[PDB]
Amino acid sequence: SEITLGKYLFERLKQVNVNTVFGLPGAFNLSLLDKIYEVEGMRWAGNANELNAAYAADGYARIKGMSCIITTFGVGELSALNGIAGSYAEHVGVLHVVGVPSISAQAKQLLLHHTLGNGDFTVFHRMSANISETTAMITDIATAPAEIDRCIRTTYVTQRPVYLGLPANLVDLNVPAKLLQTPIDMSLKPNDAESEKEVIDTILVLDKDAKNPVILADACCSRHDVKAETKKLIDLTQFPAFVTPMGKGSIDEQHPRYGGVYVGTLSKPEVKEAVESADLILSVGALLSDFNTGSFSYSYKTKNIVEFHSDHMKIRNATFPGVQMKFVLQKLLTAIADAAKGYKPVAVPARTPANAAVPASTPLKQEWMWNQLGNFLQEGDVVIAETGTSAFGINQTTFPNNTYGISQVLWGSIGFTTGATLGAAFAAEEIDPKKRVILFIGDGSLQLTVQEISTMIRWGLKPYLFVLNNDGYTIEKLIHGPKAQYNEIQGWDHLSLLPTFGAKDYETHRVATTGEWDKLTQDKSFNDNSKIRMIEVMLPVFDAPQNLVEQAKLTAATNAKQ
Amino acid sequence: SEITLGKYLFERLKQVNVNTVFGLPGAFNLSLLDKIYEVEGMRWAGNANELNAAYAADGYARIKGMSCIITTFGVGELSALNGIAGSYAEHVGVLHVVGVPSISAQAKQLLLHHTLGNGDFTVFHRMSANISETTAMITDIATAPAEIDRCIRTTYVTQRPVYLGLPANLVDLNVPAKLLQTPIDMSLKPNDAESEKEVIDTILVLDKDAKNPVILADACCSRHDVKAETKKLIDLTQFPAFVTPMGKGSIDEQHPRYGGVYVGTLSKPEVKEAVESADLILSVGALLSDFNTGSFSYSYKTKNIVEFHSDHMKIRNATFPGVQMKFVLQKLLTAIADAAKGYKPVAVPARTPANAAVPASTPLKQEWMWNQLGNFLQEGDVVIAETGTSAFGINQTTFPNNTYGISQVLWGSIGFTTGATLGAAFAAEEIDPKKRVILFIGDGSLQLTVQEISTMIRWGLKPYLFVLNNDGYTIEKLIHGPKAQYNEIQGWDHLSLLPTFGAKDYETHRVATTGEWDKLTQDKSFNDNSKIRMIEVMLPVFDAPQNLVEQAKLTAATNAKQ
């Protein structure tokens, strides 16, 4: 008949397919964490710090659908803020629960640990409200179940962080268990009928008139869950389909109508021209950040641009506030084939040619590696690429179908990917034990969050950790200060990290040549996700993908401009 | 003639005795960082992450007087916030300079990396305003020197963090170099003459009357720079002098008038009675947090209390807004000996007896270790104790005179001390190469900030890193859940950390018996700060100082109270 508020939270999380919970303990949340162990199928990650935990919750949400991190008042929550900000910026549904002092301790304004010593128990909640879609600070047991529900719903449907503060005393108070028998409503509200019809009719007419329409899938294609619809749209229409860096993975790169990675002026000439020559652009989930776009360098030649977004539509100069793309895309599928029936298929640019055979002793170079990497990938892989050369280079890698890419192009917080790898590996394990998780992280970025490797080991997760050793911050050196000491890093013994963190079942590998790369990555046992691996990749100091060389100059100029 | 705004900043920092600058680079601050190398006597730490950099700037400021951390917009600054908030809570003057997008970039609202994608460039500044004494976001070159000077002054005189945003384009513009020839005013404003005279005269008359006065030194004694005056006051009066956990180190423990560590009901009975039986209490810099006070358990039996504070005075029920203790204490030196001339000295409580001789093979215990540690310490040592058993246990250690203690009793962010150790070691090196820096950090806390050892190594800093291996979060286990899996940690090979981060000149030791403890710590070579050292200390899982056992129960009850 009755259940603790704490246990109710974990029962709800289990109902919405969140099965791993991130964060660190502190006195203000200990009684709440107890409740995790009362719920079958729920686990506590036991993160090495709160920032890493927040990055992990982000990785988990991207793969699983949403996530939860629990921290402690002041010291835990403030540690996590950069992770939460990144989740807000990139539209990732992370529920951040904070164990806060009891109602009675607040009432009496006790000078407790983890406060600013001024009796203000609102300050951290206030700070988090800036990077949250909504917040709740629970003060009474009576409406607490509904507020938990609302927070979980909002996290999921808006795909942005939500803040939920739970006083220590309230987690052990009882609420009706019967509440758990009605599901949380996880569904979008239908669109305005008249506005949605206008948009659909208008698109269909633009489609009928188009001779070279193109589809461009960007971040929100993935973040707001329209990949299936976009795939159908591609198949029914036969229109060329291109993807952005931030949306890479949202469309199948083995589809015969897939045209490549569009990055404005930084695209392959053939890709740039194929996109920009379009007489109708179907833009799915645009997020036009500097790195996503070669510093705002799109040069569409047509006015006929349809922008599909999670919360609104735009057609040419006309805006349709509130009209959600999910339902527009679904309903379009009914009549889009008819609208496209006169289309005569325009050729797409061909895939970048495979690397030519070279001697086994050929030193590894970035351009070669990114082009070679597609050989190692397989359908189902989660492929994570850190801000730095890795994020820029993965744009050149051809993905198998059904690859989930993670690249934090907008927020661009180095170190993110160590934590994201952990969360992705949890979620991937829960989905399918044979799903591989593959990380490319710079030597510089690894340093910020290196301890989260510990948490991978403790749970026997088996990601592939490729560390690009180029002796410092190459991306920065290419922006400004190529020999500046601030761009250099202390030299670590990367392959000793796993055993240092107590790993027992693992492999470590170093590759420095083309021969070594091929030998390792083509190897049958290596391709099985049987244990955690670290691969140290030795690369030259100033070597970078060409797109990064160019973007670095553009970014330098933007910042230096008077 | 003219100097860049960026170089002006570093010239000012040099003038105010800030010679190490903390933080991490990002495109928005790279041109600024260049200017560090243009100023002789200035260096860039090259921190391994921003949170650790903020903890470091905090440790540096505690030893040196104030500090500066530079981060990048969004990703850098938010990472630092837990460090900044602890500095705000514990009154440590840290100048947080953030490299922000150029004026033209903000005006056109470019969708740049490290933004929330909504074109709001004020949001992170807003967030930091909550944990800063003042803020400045520089927009006009003409007033930028004055604004820098204002921020530096405020950081130092108020001993609280200040936020300074510097658009990337502005750092390279010129300002008049002759401004540098007039020093920043770093002095307190004189007190209101009449109010101060009233306070002084009243205290001198209370003094003349008291038969059992005592002096109690707390956190703000050291944080607000009145340690010399307080010591001199003890010497002139010969009144018994006690210290709090947060103030420990502020007064000299090898002084015939030193009475012990007062912690309300957690005190030695002799110490508790000596303080609470007083007929006059001279309280210097009180900060009555839960852990500092045994959960608010002071039981003074007099109302004759003089509270000295940085920004005001209190005498019994009478408050004197704005009367700063610095000048009150200094001027009391003139006539307080005469006022105290009738005082017949009351005996002080005896110091805890030395440990009894025990067999060399006796396994190490916490209580023995804290009571032995005083043998190893020397005058001038910086002694840093992490939240957990270390912070509570260090209360039991006798300090040599002139010991700088660091224990973050109020904010209590585990991991703080790895960074604080770096900051303190930089400062100590600048003050006196022979000054030792000694850390006691738990195995759990080390995990959150472990990478900052890298930065110690790269600069050839030589602290003593004592890591307390008790297989998890013992403090938490004693509060709630002694066998809870959230209180356990992944087991690391601690002694491999130094070589894993590239150390070449170092020692590692393990101690597990009293014999091993004594042989190592009494060793003449060990006692020289000739290289970085890590000492793994093997301790039992549930072993703790008695004061923690008691505090842990009081904390649990406070959180659980309905």
Ligand SMILES: [C]C1=N[C]=C([C][N+]2=C([C@@]([C])(=O)C([O])=O)SC([C][C]OP([O])(=O)OP([O])([O])=O)=C2[C])C([N])=N1
């Ligand atoms: C958290 C954080 N911090 C800092 C930063 C910066 N960064 C980056 C950028 C781009 O972002 C800018 O600048 O803005 S990048 C970097 C470096 C990295 O390195 P690595 O990892 O090594 O890579 P490569 O390139 O070499 O491969 C930096 C520092 C951020 N972001 N975040």
Ligand SMILES: [C]C1=N[C]=C([C][N+]2=C([C@@]([C])(=O)C([O])=O)SC([C][C]OP([O])(=O)OP([O])([O])=O)=C2[C])C([N])=N1
């Ligand atoms: C950042 C951060 N996080 C978390 C936390 C919590 N904690 C602590 C306290 C007291 O604070 C509470 O509870 O709140 S403590 C801890 C643990 C530690 O462990 P170690 O280091 O290992 O030590 P010993 O010696 O005791 O064992 C925790 C987790 C904070 N704070 N912060």
Ligand SMILES: [Mg+2]
């Ligand atoms: Mg690198």
Ligand SMILES: [Mg+2]
């Ligand atoms: Mg421990």
